[PDB]
CSV table of C-alpha atoms in Angstrom, one decimal:
chain,number,residue,atom,x,y,z
A,1,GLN,CA,-125.4,77.8,74.6
A,2,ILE,CA,-121.7,77.4,75.2
A,3,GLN,CA,-120.1,78.9,72.1
A,4,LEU,CA,-116.8,80.1,70.6
A,5,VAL,CA,-117.0,83.1,68.3
A,6,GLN,CA,-113.9,83.8,66.4
A,7,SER,CA,-113.2,87.2,64.7
A,8,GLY,CA,-113.8,87.8,61.0
A,9,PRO,CA,-111.7,87.0,57.9
A,10,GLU,CA,-108.4,88.7,57.2
A,11,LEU,CA,-106.5,89.7,54.1
A,12,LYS,CA,-102.9,90.6,55.0
A,13,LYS,CA,-99.6,91.0,53.0
A,14,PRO,CA,-96.4,88.9,53.4
A,15,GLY,CA,-94.5,90.1,56.4
A,16,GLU,CA,-97.4,91.7,58.3
A,17,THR,CA,-98.8,90.5,61.6
A,18,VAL,CA,-102.3,89.2,62.3
A,19,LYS,CA,-104.2,88.7,65.6
A,20,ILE,CA,-107.2,86.3,65.7
A,21,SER,CA,-109.6,86.4,68.7
A,22,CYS,CA,-111.7,83.6,70.1
A,23,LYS,CA,-114.6,84.6,72.4
A,24,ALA,CA,-115.9,81.9,74.8
A,25,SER,CA,-119.2,82.1,76.6
A,26,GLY,CA,-121.4,79.9,78.8
A,27,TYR,CA,-118.9,78.1,81.1
A,28,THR,CA,-116.1,79.0,83.5
A,29,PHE,CA,-113.4,80.2,81.1
A,30,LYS,CA,-110.3,79.5,83.2
A,31,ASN,CA,-111.3,75.8,83.8
A,32,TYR,CA,-110.7,74.5,80.2
A,33,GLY,CA,-107.6,74.7,78.1
A,34,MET,CA,-108.0,76.2,74.6
A,35,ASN,CA,-106.5,74.6,71.5
A,36,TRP,CA,-105.6,76.2,68.1
A,37,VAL,CA,-105.9,74.2,64.9
A,38,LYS,CA,-104.8,75.1,61.4
A,39,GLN,CA,-106.4,74.0,58.1
A,40,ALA,CA,-104.7,75.0,54.8
A,41,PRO,CA,-107.1,75.1,51.8
A,42,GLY,CA,-107.8,71.5,50.8
A,43,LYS,CA,-105.7,70.1,53.6
A,44,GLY,CA,-106.4,68.3,56.9
A,45,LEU,CA,-106.5,69.5,60.4
A,46,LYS,CA,-103.2,70.2,62.2
A,47,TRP,CA,-103.0,71.0,65.9
A,48,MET,CA,-101.0,74.2,66.5
A,49,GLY,CA,-100.9,74.3,70.3
A,50,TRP,CA,-102.7,74.8,73.6
A,51,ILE,CA,-103.0,77.5,76.2
A,52,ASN,CA,-103.7,77.1,79.8
A,53,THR,CA,-106.5,79.6,80.3
A,54,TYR,CA,-105.9,80.0,84.0
A,55,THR,CA,-102.1,80.8,83.9
A,56,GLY,CA,-101.7,81.7,80.2
A,57,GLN,CA,-98.9,79.2,79.7
A,58,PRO,CA,-98.7,78.3,76.0
A,59,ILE,CA,-97.5,75.0,74.6
A,60,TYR,CA,-96.5,75.1,70.9
A,61,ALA,CA,-96.5,72.2,68.5
A,62,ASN,CA,-93.1,71.5,66.7
A,63,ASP,CA,-94.2,73.0,63.4
A,64,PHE,CA,-95.6,76.2,65.1
A,65,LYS,CA,-92.4,77.1,67.0
A,66,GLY,CA,-91.4,80.6,65.9
A,67,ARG,CA,-93.9,83.2,64.8
A,68,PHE,CA,-96.9,82.1,66.8
A,69,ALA,CA,-98.1,83.6,70.1
A,70,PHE,CA,-101.1,82.4,72.2
A,71,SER,CA,-102.4,84.9,74.7
A,72,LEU,CA,-105.4,85.7,76.8
A,73,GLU,CA,-107.7,88.3,78.2
A,74,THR,CA,-109.2,86.2,81.0
A,75,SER,CA,-111.4,89.3,81.8
A,76,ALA,CA,-113.2,88.8,78.5
A,77,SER,CA,-113.0,85.0,78.2
A,78,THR,CA,-111.1,85.6,75.0
A,79,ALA,CA,-108.1,83.7,73.6
A,80,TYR,CA,-105.9,85.3,71.0
A,81,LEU,CA,-103.6,83.9,68.3
A,82,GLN,CA,-101.0,86.2,66.8
A,83,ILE,CA,-99.0,85.3,63.7
A,84,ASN,CA,-95.8,87.3,62.9
A,85,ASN,CA,-94.0,87.8,59.6
A,86,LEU,CA,-96.8,86.2,57.6
A,87,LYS,CA,-95.9,83.9,54.7
A,88,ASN,CA,-98.0,82.5,51.9
A,89,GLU,CA,-98.0,79.1,53.7
A,90,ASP,CA,-100.0,80.8,56.5
A,91,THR,CA,-103.0,81.2,54.3
A,92,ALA,CA,-105.5,78.8,56.0
A,93,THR,CA,-108.5,78.7,58.3
A,94,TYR,CA,-107.7,78.9,62.0
A,95,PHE,CA,-109.9,77.3,64.7
A,96,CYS,CA,-110.0,77.6,68.4
A,97,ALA,CA,-111.2,74.4,70.1
A,98,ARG,CA,-112.0,73.9,73.8
A,99,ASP,CA,-110.7,71.0,75.9
A,100,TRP,CA,-113.3,68.3,76.6
A,101,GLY,CA,-116.4,67.9,74.4
A,102,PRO,CA,-117.6,69.2,71.1
A,103,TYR,CA,-116.9,72.9,71.2
A,104,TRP,CA,-115.2,74.6,68.2
A,105,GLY,CA,-115.0,78.1,66.9
A,106,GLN,CA,-116.6,78.7,63.5
A,107,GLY,CA,-113.1,79.5,62.1
A,108,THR,CA,-111.1,82.5,60.9
A,109,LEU,CA,-110.0,82.5,57.3
A,110,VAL,CA,-106.6,84.3,56.8
A,111,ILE,CA,-105.5,85.1,53.3
A,112,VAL,CA,-101.8,86.1,52.8
A,113,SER,CA,-101.3,87.8,49.5
A,114,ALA,CA,-99.7,90.9,47.9
A,115,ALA,CA,-102.8,91.3,45.8
A,116,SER,CA,-105.4,94.0,46.5
A,117,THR,CA,-109.1,93.4,46.9
A,118,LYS,CA,-111.1,94.0,43.7
A,119,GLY,CA,-114.8,93.8,43.1
A,120,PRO,CA,-116.3,91.5,40.4
A,121,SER,CA,-118.0,92.2,37.1
A,122,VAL,CA,-121.3,90.4,36.7
A,123,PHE,CA,-122.4,89.2,33.2
A,124,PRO,CA,-125.6,87.4,32.2
A,125,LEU,CA,-125.5,83.8,31.1
A,126,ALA,CA,-128.6,83.7,28.7
A,127,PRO,CA,-130.4,80.8,26.9
A,128,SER,CA,-132.7,73.3,23.7
A,129,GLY,CA,-135.0,70.6,24.9
A,130,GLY,CA,-137.6,70.9,27.6
A,131,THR,CA,-135.4,72.7,30.2
A,132,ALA,CA,-133.8,76.1,29.9
A,133,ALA,CA,-130.6,77.2,31.8
A,134,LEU,CA,-129.6,80.7,32.6
A,135,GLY,CA,-127.0,82.2,34.9
A,136,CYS,CA,-124.6,84.8,36.1
A,137,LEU,CA,-120.9,84.9,35.5
A,138,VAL,CA,-119.1,86.6,38.4
A,139,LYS,CA,-115.6,87.2,37.3
A,140,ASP,CA,-112.3,88.9,38.4
A,141,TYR,CA,-112.7,89.5,42.1
A,142,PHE,CA,-110.3,89.1,45.1
A,143,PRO,CA,-110.3,87.6,47.6
A,144,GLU,CA,-113.1,85.0,48.2
A,145,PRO,CA,-116.0,84.8,48.8
A,146,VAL,CA,-118.8,85.9,46.6
A,147,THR,CA,-122.3,84.9,47.5
A,148,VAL,CA,-125.0,84.5,44.9
A,149,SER,CA,-128.7,84.2,45.3
A,150,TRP,CA,-131.7,84.3,42.9
A,151,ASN,CA,-134.8,86.5,42.9
A,152,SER,CA,-133.8,87.6,46.4
A,153,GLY,CA,-133.7,84.1,47.7
A,154,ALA,CA,-137.2,83.1,46.4
A,155,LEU,CA,-135.6,80.9,43.7
A,156,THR,CA,-133.6,78.0,45.2
A,157,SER,CA,-134.7,74.8,43.4
A,158,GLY,CA,-132.4,74.0,40.5
A,159,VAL,CA,-129.7,76.6,41.5
A,160,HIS,CA,-126.0,75.7,41.2
A,161,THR,CA,-123.3,78.1,42.3
A,162,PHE,CA,-120.0,76.6,41.4
A,163,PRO,CA,-116.8,76.8,43.5
A,164,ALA,CA,-114.7,79.7,42.3
A,165,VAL,CA,-111.5,79.1,40.2
A,166,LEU,CA,-108.3,81.0,40.4
A,167,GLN,CA,-107.5,82.5,37.0
A,168,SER,CA,-104.1,83.1,35.6
A,169,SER,CA,-104.8,86.8,36.3
A,170,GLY,CA,-104.6,86.0,40.0
A,171,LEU,CA,-108.3,86.8,40.3
A,172,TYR,CA,-111.3,84.6,41.1
A,173,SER,CA,-114.3,83.7,38.9
A,174,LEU,CA,-117.4,81.7,39.5
A,175,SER,CA,-120.8,81.1,37.8
A,176,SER,CA,-124.3,80.6,39.2
A,177,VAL,CA,-126.8,78.7,37.0
A,178,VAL,CA,-130.5,77.7,37.4
A,179,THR,CA,-132.5,75.4,35.3
A,180,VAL,CA,-136.3,76.0,34.7
A,181,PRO,CA,-138.8,74.5,32.2
A,182,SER,CA,-138.6,76.2,28.9
A,183,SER,CA,-142.3,77.1,28.8
A,184,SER,CA,-141.7,79.3,32.0
A,185,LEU,CA,-139.3,81.8,30.5
A,186,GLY,CA,-140.8,85.1,29.5
A,187,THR,CA,-143.6,85.3,32.1
A,188,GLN,CA,-141.0,84.8,34.9
A,189,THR,CA,-138.2,87.2,35.9
A,190,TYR,CA,-134.6,86.1,36.8
A,191,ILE,CA,-132.4,88.3,38.9
A,192,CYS,CA,-129.1,87.1,40.4
A,193,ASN,CA,-128.1,88.9,43.7
A,194,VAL,CA,-124.3,89.0,43.9
A,195,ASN,CA,-122.5,90.0,47.1
A,196,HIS,CA,-118.7,90.4,47.5
A,197,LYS,CA,-118.3,91.8,51.0
A,198,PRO,CA,-114.5,92.5,50.9
A,199,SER,CA,-115.0,95.2,48.2
A,200,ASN,CA,-118.5,96.1,49.4
A,201,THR,CA,-120.0,95.1,46.1
A,202,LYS,CA,-123.8,94.4,45.8
A,203,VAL,CA,-125.2,93.8,42.3
A,204,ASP,CA,-128.7,92.7,41.0
A,205,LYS,CA,-128.4,91.5,37.4
A,206,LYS,CA,-131.5,90.6,35.4
A,207,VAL,CA,-130.9,87.7,33.0
A,208,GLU,CA,-133.2,87.1,30.0
A,209,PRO,CA,-133.0,85.6,26.5
B,1,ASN,CA,-95.1,62.4,70.0
B,2,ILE,CA,-98.1,60.2,69.0
B,3,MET,CA,-98.6,59.9,65.3
B,4,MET,CA,-101.9,59.0,63.6
B,5,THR,CA,-102.3,57.1,60.4
B,6,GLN,CA,-105.8,57.0,58.9
B,7,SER,CA,-106.8,54.6,56.2
B,8,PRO,CA,-108.1,54.6,53.5
B,9,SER,CA,-107.5,58.1,52.4
B,10,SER,CA,-110.6,58.1,50.2
B,11,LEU,CA,-113.5,55.8,49.6
B,12,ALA,CA,-116.7,55.7,47.5
B,13,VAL,CA,-119.7,53.8,48.8
B,14,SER,CA,-123.3,53.3,47.6
B,15,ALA,CA,-126.0,54.7,50.0
B,16,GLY,CA,-127.0,51.9,52.3
B,17,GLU,CA,-123.6,50.2,52.2
B,18,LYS,CA,-121.4,49.9,55.3
B,19,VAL,CA,-118.5,52.3,55.7
B,20,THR,CA,-115.3,51.6,57.7
B,21,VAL,CA,-112.5,54.0,58.6
B,22,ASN,CA,-109.4,52.8,60.4
B,23,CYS,CA,-107.0,54.8,62.6
B,24,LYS,CA,-103.6,53.5,63.9
B,25,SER,CA,-101.8,55.3,66.7
B,26,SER,CA,-98.0,55.0,67.0
B,27,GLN,CA,-98.4,54.6,70.7
B,28,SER,CA,-101.2,53.3,72.9
B,29,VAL,CA,-103.8,55.9,73.9
B,30,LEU,CA,-105.4,53.6,76.5
B,31,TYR,CA,-104.7,55.3,79.8
B,32,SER,CA,-104.0,52.4,82.1
B,33,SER,CA,-105.5,53.8,85.4
B,34,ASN,CA,-108.9,54.6,84.0
B,35,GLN,CA,-109.1,52.1,81.1
B,36,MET,CA,-110.3,54.8,78.7
B,37,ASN,CA,-109.0,55.2,75.1
B,38,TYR,CA,-108.2,58.9,74.5
B,39,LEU,CA,-109.5,58.9,71.0
B,40,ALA,CA,-112.2,60.9,69.2
B,41,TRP,CA,-113.7,60.8,65.7
B,42,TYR,CA,-114.9,63.9,63.8
B,43,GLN,CA,-117.0,64.6,60.7
B,44,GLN,CA,-116.2,67.8,58.7
B,45,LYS,CA,-118.2,69.2,55.8
B,46,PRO,CA,-117.2,72.0,53.4
B,47,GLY,CA,-117.1,75.4,55.1
B,48,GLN,CA,-117.9,74.1,58.6
B,49,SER,CA,-116.0,73.4,61.7
B,50,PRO,CA,-115.5,69.7,62.5
B,51,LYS,CA,-118.4,68.0,64.3
B,52,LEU,CA,-117.6,65.5,67.1
B,53,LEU,CA,-119.1,62.0,66.5
B,54,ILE,CA,-117.5,59.7,69.0
B,55,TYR,CA,-115.1,60.1,72.0
B,56,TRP,CA,-113.4,57.7,74.4
B,57,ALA,CA,-113.2,55.5,71.2
B,58,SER,CA,-116.8,54.3,71.4
B,59,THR,CA,-119.1,56.8,73.1
B,60,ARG,CA,-121.5,58.7,70.8
B,61,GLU,CA,-121.9,62.5,71.2
B,62,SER,CA,-125.4,63.5,71.9
B,63,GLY,CA,-127.6,63.9,68.8
B,64,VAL,CA,-125.3,61.7,66.7
B,65,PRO,CA,-127.3,59.1,64.8
B,66,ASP,CA,-127.1,55.4,65.6
B,67,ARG,CA,-125.4,54.5,62.3
B,68,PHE,CA,-122.1,56.0,63.6
B,69,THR,CA,-120.2,53.8,66.0
B,70,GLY,CA,-116.6,53.7,67.2
B,71,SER,CA,-114.7,50.6,68.3
B,72,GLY,CA,-111.2,49.5,69.1
B,73,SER,CA,-108.6,50.0,71.9
B,74,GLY,CA,-104.9,50.6,72.3
B,75,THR,CA,-103.6,51.4,68.9
B,76,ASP,CA,-106.3,50.1,66.5
B,77,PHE,CA,-109.5,52.2,66.1
B,78,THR,CA,-112.4,52.1,63.6
B,79,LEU,CA,-115.3,54.4,62.8
B,80,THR,CA,-118.2,52.4,61.3
B,81,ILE,CA,-121.1,53.8,59.4
B,82,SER,CA,-123.5,50.9,59.4
B,83,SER,CA,-125.8,52.2,56.6
B,84,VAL,CA,-124.3,55.3,55.0
B,85,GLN,CA,-126.8,57.9,54.2
B,86,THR,CA,-126.6,60.3,51.1
B,87,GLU,CA,-125.8,63.3,53.3
B,88,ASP,CA,-122.8,61.6,55.0
B,89,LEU,CA,-120.4,62.6,52.3
B,90,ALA,CA,-117.6,64.4,54.2
B,91,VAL,CA,-114.0,64.2,55.5
B,92,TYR,CA,-113.7,62.1,58.7
B,93,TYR,CA,-110.8,62.7,61.2
B,94,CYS,CA,-109.7,60.6,64.1
B,95,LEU,CA,-108.0,62.5,67.0
B,96,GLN,CA,-105.8,61.3,69.8
B,97,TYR,CA,-106.0,63.6,72.8
B,98,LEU,CA,-103.9,61.7,75.4
B,99,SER,CA,-100.6,63.6,75.0
B,100,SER,CA,-101.3,66.8,73.2
B,101,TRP,CA,-103.6,66.5,70.1
B,102,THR,CA,-102.9,64.7,66.9
B,103,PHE,CA,-105.3,64.5,64.0
B,104,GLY,CA,-105.4,61.8,61.4
B,105,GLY,CA,-104.8,62.6,57.8
B,106,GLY,CA,-108.6,62.5,57.2
B,107,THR,CA,-110.8,60.2,55.0
B,108,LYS,CA,-112.9,61.7,52.3
B,109,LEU,CA,-116.2,59.8,51.8
B,110,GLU,CA,-118.2,60.0,48.6
B,111,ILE,CA,-121.4,58.3,47.4
B,112,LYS,CA,-122.0,56.1,44.5
B,113,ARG,CA,-125.3,55.8,42.7
B,114,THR,CA,-126.9,54.7,39.4
B,115,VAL,CA,-125.4,56.4,36.3
B,116,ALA,CA,-127.2,59.6,35.3
B,117,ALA,CA,-126.4,61.4,32.0
B,118,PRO,CA,-125.8,65.2,32.1
B,119,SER,CA,-127.9,67.8,30.5
B,120,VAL,CA,-125.6,70.0,28.5
B,121,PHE,CA,-126.0,73.8,27.9
B,122,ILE,CA,-123.7,76.3,26.2
B,123,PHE,CA,-123.6,80.0,26.8
B,124,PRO,CA,-122.1,82.6,24.4
B,125,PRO,CA,-120.2,85.6,25.9
B,126,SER,CA,-122.5,88.5,26.6
B,127,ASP,CA,-122.1,91.7,24.7
B,128,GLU,CA,-121.5,93.6,28.0
B,129,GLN,CA,-118.4,91.5,28.5
B,130,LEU,CA,-117.2,91.8,24.9
B,131,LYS,CA,-117.0,95.6,25.4
B,132,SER,CA,-114.5,94.9,28.3
B,133,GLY,CA,-112.2,93.0,25.8
B,134,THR,CA,-112.6,89.4,27.0
B,135,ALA,CA,-114.8,86.6,25.8
B,136,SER,CA,-116.0,83.9,28.2
B,137,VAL,CA,-117.9,80.9,26.8
B,138,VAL,CA,-119.5,78.6,29.4
B,139,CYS,CA,-120.5,74.9,29.1
B,140,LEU,CA,-122.8,73.5,31.8
B,141,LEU,CA,-123.2,69.8,32.6
B,142,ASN,CA,-126.2,69.4,34.9
B,143,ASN,CA,-127.0,66.8,37.6
B,144,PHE,CA,-125.1,63.8,36.5
B,145,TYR,CA,-123.2,60.8,37.9
B,146,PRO,CA,-120.4,59.8,37.9
B,147,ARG,CA,-118.1,62.8,38.1
B,148,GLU,CA,-115.8,61.6,35.3
B,149,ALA,CA,-116.5,63.6,32.2
B,150,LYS,CA,-114.6,64.8,29.1
B,151,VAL,CA,-115.5,68.3,27.9
B,152,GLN,CA,-113.7,69.3,24.7
B,153,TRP,CA,-113.8,72.9,23.3
B,154,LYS,CA,-113.6,73.5,19.6
B,155,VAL,CA,-113.5,76.9,17.8
B,156,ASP,CA,-114.1,76.6,14.1
B,157,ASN,CA,-113.0,73.0,14.5
B,158,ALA,CA,-109.8,73.8,16.4
B,159,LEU,CA,-109.2,71.9,19.6
B,160,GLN,CA,-108.7,74.3,22.5
B,161,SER,CA,-106.1,73.1,25.0
B,162,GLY,CA,-105.2,75.0,28.1
B,163,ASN,CA,-107.5,78.1,28.0
B,164,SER,CA,-110.4,76.7,29.9
B,165,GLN,CA,-111.1,76.0,33.6
B,166,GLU,CA,-113.5,73.4,35.0
B,167,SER,CA,-115.5,73.7,38.2
B,168,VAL,CA,-117.5,71.0,40.0
B,169,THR,CA,-120.2,71.4,42.6
B,170,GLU,CA,-120.2,69.5,45.8
B,171,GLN,CA,-121.9,66.1,45.4
B,172,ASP,CA,-125.6,66.6,46.1
B,173,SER,CA,-126.5,65.3,49.6
B,174,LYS,CA,-130.0,64.2,48.6
B,175,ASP,CA,-129.6,62.6,45.1
B,176,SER,CA,-125.8,62.3,44.9
B,177,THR,CA,-125.2,64.0,41.5
B,178,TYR,CA,-122.7,66.6,40.4
B,179,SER,CA,-122.9,69.6,38.1
B,180,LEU,CA,-119.8,70.8,36.2
B,181,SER,CA,-119.0,74.0,34.3
B,182,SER,CA,-116.2,74.5,31.8
B,183,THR,CA,-115.4,78.1,30.8
B,184,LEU,CA,-113.3,79.0,27.8
B,185,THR,CA,-111.6,82.4,27.8
B,186,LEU,CA,-110.6,84.2,24.7
B,187,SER,CA,-109.8,87.8,23.7
B,188,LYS,CA,-112.4,89.9,22.1
B,189,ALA,CA,-110.4,90.1,18.9
B,190,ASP,CA,-110.0,86.3,18.8
B,191,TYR,CA,-113.6,85.6,19.6
B,192,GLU,CA,-114.9,87.9,16.8
B,193,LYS,CA,-112.6,86.2,14.4
B,194,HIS,CA,-114.4,82.8,14.4
B,195,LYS,CA,-117.9,81.4,13.9
B,196,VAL,CA,-118.6,78.0,15.4
B,197,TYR,CA,-118.1,77.6,19.1
B,198,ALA,CA,-118.7,74.0,20.2
B,199,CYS,CA,-118.7,72.1,23.5
B,200,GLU,CA,-118.3,68.3,23.1
B,201,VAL,CA,-119.3,66.2,26.1
B,202,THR,CA,-118.4,62.5,26.6
B,203,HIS,CA,-119.9,60.7,29.6
B,204,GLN,CA,-120.7,57.2,30.6
B,205,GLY,CA,-124.4,58.0,30.7
B,206,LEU,CA,-124.7,59.3,27.1
B,207,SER,CA,-125.0,56.6,24.4
B,208,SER,CA,-122.7,58.8,22.3
B,209,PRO,CA,-120.9,62.1,22.7
B,210,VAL,CA,-123.1,65.2,22.8
B,211,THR,CA,-122.2,68.5,21.2
B,212,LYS,CA,-123.8,71.8,22.1
B,213,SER,CA,-122.7,74.6,19.8
B,214,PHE,CA,-123.6,78.1,18.5
B,215,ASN,CA,-122.6,80.3,15.6
B,216,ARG,CA,-121.4,83.7,16.8
B,217,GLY,CA,-124.3,85.8,15.7
B,218,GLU,CA,-127.4,83.7,15.9
């Protein structure tokens, strides 16, 4: 296992500074340049730059010329990317990517926003023909993501957790639904497990007709 | 600086058809002393980092299935999927790595299949939410193809325009269908002032529009 482990997601305010770390393991660190790649939500991949991991010399792409600093800690085989005076257009996922071969970090989502993190409220979506649908409405949280599972992960077939939408409030909202045969309600129990790590919210909501 | 133009930007293909993606570099990426094209092709799926398919224009990465092949040289490059599989829906990127890196714009691939009509379900707002002062009404369209669908909200026969948001799942990587939710938001006071909440669904698979509805209080 050669791998690149980037640090976790960030929520920062316009004007602040963020520093993303990329940990490499399994090969001689100083022998391969490291690239940084930006992906704005819904957009393509854009190469940001490259750092010589022996000498620490950075080379910046044209569009990444001012507030962007590549650095190293050779000792720890770790490359860093610092972004200064954050703007809304810096909201994106940031990847480190090693010269030569297939190796990419898992990505670091950075959210730039004046808005504060808020936990969701969870409401039941309760029940046709032969199939019954039920669900959970997870509404008014910030920022993404919420995860949803059912019956502690023992119900997967027929589950649909939709992509969240941004409400006019500035808060996010999603639904999770599952379809089962009508005859099966009433002997079976339906619990949606909702997790919103940024606010440290964990809810188990029982849904029934 | 070497620019990369990928084409088409978007395509829809039936499973089993051949897929072709083209990449033009503004300058050659054939390094003359080793006769190697400095060009890679990537697959990227939602929430994942991109996955290398092909490098030096036509060498497969290990573990990459046979149906993916790269060809071309100089400025013209093509990624071919000889028999596209249902799980291949993704965004595909070419990358030049001869002089810095430049990614193509990406090509989004989707799957076509036989028409499949949605199941429709309507959910009233729960009482727990009504205490909070907001009323959410949800319409679900389940496991249908194609994605194109009209979902009209009516409240006591009044067309609701602009107070609903739609959400669509990723296309299923096994059977190639979508599910869609439309959610109508109202105030508690507005909700409790009306009776008939209706979700009208028009879709190529239904022989005529389908309406799921409830009276507030049944």
